[model samples]
Target: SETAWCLDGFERPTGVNPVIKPLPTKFYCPMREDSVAWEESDTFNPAATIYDGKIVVMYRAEDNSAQGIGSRTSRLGYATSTDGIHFERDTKPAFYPAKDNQAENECPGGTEDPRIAMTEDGTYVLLYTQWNRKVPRLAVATSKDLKHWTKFGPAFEKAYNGKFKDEATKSASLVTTLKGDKQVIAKVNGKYFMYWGEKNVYAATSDNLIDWDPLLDENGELLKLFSPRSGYFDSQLTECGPPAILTKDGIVLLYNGKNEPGEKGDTAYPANSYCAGQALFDVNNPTKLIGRLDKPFLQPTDDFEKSGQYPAGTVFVEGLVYYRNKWYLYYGCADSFVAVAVSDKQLNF
Candidate 1:
């Protein structure tokens, strides 16, 4: 169960794990109809990056009195933290589903599940779901100030002449190498690589972070690096977590895996539970699976993560940042709240 990447897995704070949660009256959105309580219902699934010596998290927020997932309109909100535990969120959304080129896939369901990375010039790249509740298309966006953004449609919109443009897509984790506690987007073979998909993890390549082309097998189908395992915690599906770390050992991918339903589920956890584990891919060839954790390194152990929207107990990690000589893991707690975990010690990346 203890893989190389799990030798010293991240540790959660005893009393401060769930650092941020839904603030019903904290923010009102002008973009919505007559200034709605956009940050009222739920807030989770954050994308993290370091900006101006502070951690800037772009998290998905929903507005509704109703319970459960996919029932409310989601918008992206911003929060800044210096210590990686306490955050000061803004009053308005930094990015939202607007009347633009991607409106059909983004309007009703809005935006959700962000993964972030940074380039050398200090430009932040975001990969988020344009969820219309129809198909969760993976869309790309860019920001200079972490507040204003420019949407660039789907990542596969121009790949293979739009072959996979209409296909359902989400969850993109770019490869980033560490540099003095900052994650700098890295390129292999002169192209940037990203791990994506919610059901089966797949590989993609991009010359630019905006337009991406998925790696294909001999039959030209999407190459599946790995998937759910029977009788294991990932019996349901596996999703890419944060932007993968380009460690000297390999590409360290911290991923989200789900337990199956009923008899097919891992008995240790509830059915349909989402837990996080580690996987290693070839640094030179990102498509090759090198190693994986047989058991989950992180899952819902507290009451907070087990009692919310999508309540089968979930610890959905989407944001990872190495700052101040420590690794910060920002994750969504049951699609309801933002929680954090820290590396036990300084890791050898």
Candidate 2:
């Protein structure tokens, strides 16, 4: 018999499933004075990795202190955990849009939704959304030590002589293959593969990690690898989640799927809920989708996940790591706080 592949392979902690809930009383809270106005409102969407023997999570923090709600600015904050459950956060943000370095691409709007990947040489590459007042672009930065980072700006600027340079892009989940125990950016046939987009999923390739060339179909348009399914949990939209994990069986991508309002789909949750689902792609040809779960495995159920900055509910996952003999899955809840789930057993083919 074939083995089953579902998120239940991971177990949620009943006692404190949202192991790292929002700390309303903390100084980093948007309402607090000590925090920078950019991060005063909420903390969520962490990009996590194991660094220097500790779990380091770099999360998105938002503040409506200057411009309320819809006009909020976002910044990246940091936290570290020895046990993966308990974390001590830094009072200051790890990365934010600065005036001196601010280009037209990233200004007034700030940085958001970071997805991190490590290179073969132990350097960390952060793929984040550089939000300008008008549009969002997929951006990149590098760090030897996660503390200090150097920005490389919009990833698509140099590709095709700046064609699609100003196009809106978000959520870059690198196609990663494992080497021993760590996941590294995959270089299949000497080129790197990344899955990214918003309304639909698309593919892009890179010769070097910085410059990315998007894949185009025969029509000479952006290749649409996947799209939302009507009347399903992913009826509204399908966005790439954490960096994909390449196993012996295939490339396992955990992604976020939004349900359309009044759509005949997963009736257990309200409309517009962001749920997490799994997909398997051919490891040899990253473009080919081999298998995928028909329904979402992780959905909003807890009150914390059902309320906050995004009241409709969200489980926007962005981090996955194999650490200390377990798989730790980290996600943002309601666009307000960070939470984690763990799996004791390794995912099998």
Candidate 3:
């Protein structure tokens, strides 16, 4: 009696897709040891959640200290809105690399790509990439007010005695279910599950919000749920978007797919483009993949989405939230700007 559809779909408002841009001013950098012109370079890849009856977003912001993409340090900037269109942003970064415990994994390159999972009672958990410029690994943090953050380091830091702790990891789509109108974190079979990876998608299980262990096969390798499909939008990579949501049919995962740049990618779009795609997974067994969309549901179309630091195009979906009965999909535009789209479909499933 149900189909695993994440939403009906998402479409951007004309002439106003890029809702957030780099700040005109600068903020003092704690690690740089000086005042840095923060967020003048880029601001993209956001995480969305509701707080105090408003949709709050934590966007990845960068400074122009370094020359290219992934070279400069990144920080999470906070903003909030009621209509999901306009936002009131904070002065400085809410979460960033510091000289504290996570400095080793966060220095120089800082933090990038955030995904938040809200809980009902305890503190909120946020998933972000720790780019030390050496290995980009997935890390976790806890916050009570979303302003002051406490980093718990990497997810697999102590799992199985740090077995997969050092593996090059990024992106995490924690499985979540609706509790009232808020999409709080849910436990499947008494364990928290997340779909993560940039090259190929994989699942990991967690007992507490801090520690996570990957689902390995008998051969002691990461059991792949699905990988890049040749001649398609995700030919090069598959990056899980916001937390996957549970539906009646199963769990629906909305993800970002990077097409191979050049003659190898799907001919319908330019090479090296990032788009949005959806997949269905078995709810009972989170590791089981049901199916995926053959083509990207949301592709780059605007000029802002086409030309940026890392272009051909990007409609990189990272934040998805249900606000006031409408589905809001927030994304990065060609790794330069923060954009958003909306779907009016009521997720009654």
Candidate 4:
């Protein structure tokens, strides 16, 4: 989830309305220099957090077509913006495959799609996937100043016996929940809450941001709550964005959903694949669902969002933060480039 930083002269917008715009070009990674050999292949899916008037972003940059699913060569790039629109990429990447650790051999594949969260005390915690063949489990790392991150092993405890995959060679059911993405940390009444989505939106709580308690269990593997009702915008399973906002109505959860016939297909819709949806939850106990949008608020558009190397039609937003009384939705369109939209709604309770 996104947070607002303290800016010097920038005045907060007046009204509560959504402002959709492609972040200025200066904020994007340099297609010619920052990437590997195959530059500009697709660069989006950003994780962001605001601190001290600076918005720090960690995003995925894939430049190789052959490096699909099991290559440890992709780079995790970094950028920061003061005005929340223009960013400057770091001279060096913030994260890449470990050339000097067990990850060198054990992690033959590189990392992708990073989601970051900042704790109350200024520590930054990052949750991302370790991709190979199967759905990669959630991995973690941390940073103090938003730069120079330190890799931690897995973020959640592994459960060997579960309803999900249990093949002898398959990875253990870590987190006991479905596969996770866009994990954002939020504090409620002094407790830490983590909201993530894979098959559906799921949640867990912790005294500290590190360790967590199970919030769902179905027969064996973790259970996920459905989007409110059938035919709802998120009737299909949901994907996560940044963090949750504690609003007067409840917790405003911003996420993405896909709607297509049949369970799986390469090109089912071919035109409209991924879109955005919102749900409201009880602020005191966010686990309780209060209200959900019946349809998507944002859909796939723009040439970059509609056409990409991976899926033909999809616009996905993964990372976001609320800054200057606005919601900055950082997203990847067609997996091509990172763009953002701002919501002026005051999601407060």
Candidate 5:
């Protein structure tokens, strides 16, 4: 998918200062022991949606200090705010920690990044990554009221353990894949289109969010499928972040990409080769590619965004929203702080 540049801004509003910092010590992960628990992380990598006049933040929590690896463990956290700029978080996590049999035990990971989709009838569907060792997979959960959640199990699978048929294996794969991250579901002409990826952005679809089929049927379940017309912007590297925006031009995809090499251990450089770009997909048939940006609209910068607590030179986005006629982008900088960006132009898809 692809889109043209409309506007971009910083995580912190110019000169106003941050509303909340370090995710509040009271809400830090209890399992994290070494360093400051919540100080090192806060990136809710999913677009925010309004429900009952509250802005719900569905983000990944890390106490291990590493991006996704650590002794402390990572899980999903929830926070709500009336004003998108100011937020209050719940001390306890919204999603439970993985059980003993889940792959989460291996790497200390759990339900990771999540995307929110609102059904026509006003129900919220959460599409998120389930992580573990065997093979990362996708899972879904539905909620009428954002508070109570019901797990929907694995809606999609990966090619890790030969399509392990056992129920336990499938469950494990779903748990393991939580680290897969980045899930989006959108309806085009009443058909649902989903996209997600870590190494690269993958695409898939379904009549409903429950049953899924590969984007490319011939390529062994469409592993790491790429968009045909989105090569200009996402050519070097890419991953779909939020849901595709329905637009006059096409389906606008606000995604992250990078061109830098990976740096090991140090949480300062290149780990976040991520930069923000846009692309478009065929509205009538989202599977068909359309347009994309050649240059990044946003990239990692500043001491915090480039190198800091986690990894250097990483600026990854996990959230996008349009509120009060202003475009807001909530992102994580070096996995240390949750930042926001606003655009001068209206966020019209």
Candidate 6:
């Protein structure tokens, strides 16, 4: 009997919703020198996994106290928790731009929005956006322990003779399945699948995990597996959130959908709001969409989620973990703070 709790439609945790808020007073943001510098600005968009019997999170932190909002540098911070709700964060950032390699690929702007997936060999792979000159590129790094990471540059630099060598890439959601008690990269017919993109969802396949081959149609263009539905919560854009979770029913993906400007969706959230929604894909053929949620399962209602760099409101989900006895859904609140929602109820699918 499986004891894993799944997210049919996620629900917020009890008490204050945002389980992890930003430490605006802390001097953790690396770009500032004044008292308002460092982690004092924002801390959101986390990547989570259960390690050594505890929930470990690597979240994005920013500080605009020294520079303006868009000029702030982003860094990855570490935190650990006994339970899913309460966390003890580290004072120093775990990952950031390397000083030795101050190249145009990752300078001026730092790393942002990380999604994590583990390999069967026990290696932790982090997929993040390397913001260089504001050009978002999907990059990968590997770590034996989550503390130290080795950068592999752009994820598509060598694939298909550099076909997507100059294309701007961002979000990556790796296919993951349970291995014993932990979630590891799933192998469908010996190849791994990943869903990633900005405006629409795209698919990619990898055999070695470092080099990925983007799925292209006969016309030699990136295949768009999923697109935003007009007049829905995900009217404008549908971006991949956390790593896709494989279940008995299908592949469950919790994604962030941006509403069209001035268009109210079924959720009643105002236009330009970012909300979390669910989609089901065929387990065997990941490109095939099985079902989708018409309305968003999670939306921003709290002040912390309604006010930030993206002010309209955002519940941008990225991290999810099935730890202990509950399913934990961790997300960024308006790109300013980290929050979590847990569901113990089983999926009826």
Best by TM-score: 3
Per-residue alpha-carbon lDDT of candidate 4 for residues 171-257, written as tens digits (9 for 90 to 100): 111111111222235567667666665566766566655444445666544546544234444445577665665545566666777
TM-score of each: 0.95, 0.92, 0.96, 0.74, 0.75, 0.91
- C-alpha lDDT (0 to 100) for residue 273 of candidate 4: 65
- Model 1 agreement with the true structure over 8-118: per-residue lDDT tens digits: 457887788677777765454433446677878888888888898899888888888355578778888889999999999888788887667778888688889999899
Give residue 42's lDDT in candidate 4 (0 to 100): 55
TM-score of 6: 0.91
Per-residue lDDT over 1-349 for candidate 3, one digit per residue giving the tens place of the 0 to 100 score? 2333656567897677688899865777889888887788899999988887888899999998888888999999999999999999988889999888999999889999999988768477899999988999899999988987889999888887888888999899998888777688888999999999999999899989899999888998997899888789899999899899987677889898898976677888788888889898888987777868888889888998987977687888889899888889999999999998988876645
Worst 10 residues of 2 by lDDT: 24-33
lDDT of 6: 0.80
Candidate 2 or 4, higher TM-score? 2
Q: Model 3, which residues run further than 4 Å from truth?
A: 1-4, 262-264
- lDDT values for all models: 0.84, 0.79, 0.87, 0.55, 0.54, 0.80
Provide the lowest-lDDT 10-residue window in model 4: 170-179
Q: In candidate 5, how many Å is residue 98 off?
A: 4.4
Give me the displacement of residue 302 in model 1, in angstroms.
0.9
Report the Cα lDDT for residue 124, model 6. Answer: 91
Q: Rank the candidates by TM-score, best first.
A: 3, 1, 2, 6, 5, 4
- How many steric overlaps are in each model, in order? 0, 2, 0, 11, 27, 4
Best by lDDT: 3
Candidate 2 lDDT, 1-349, residue by residue in tens: 1325443466666666565544433344332224445555777888998788888888888766554443666778788888788888877778877654545666667789999988888889899988866888999998988878988888898887888788988898997766767768777667888889878889899988888999998877899888888777887888999998777777778899988887466665579889988787787888898877787778887787887788788988898887887878889998888888888766553
Descending-lDDT candidate ranking: 3, 1, 6, 2, 4, 5
**lDDT string, candidate 6, 1-349, tens digits:** 2213236545676675666666754543333333434466778999998777789888888866345555767778888998888898887777776554534666657888999988888899999988766577898898988887888888888988999967889899999987656789887667988999879999898888878889998999999998887689898889999999877778888899998875445447677889988788888888898878777788897888887777887999999887886778889998888988887755533
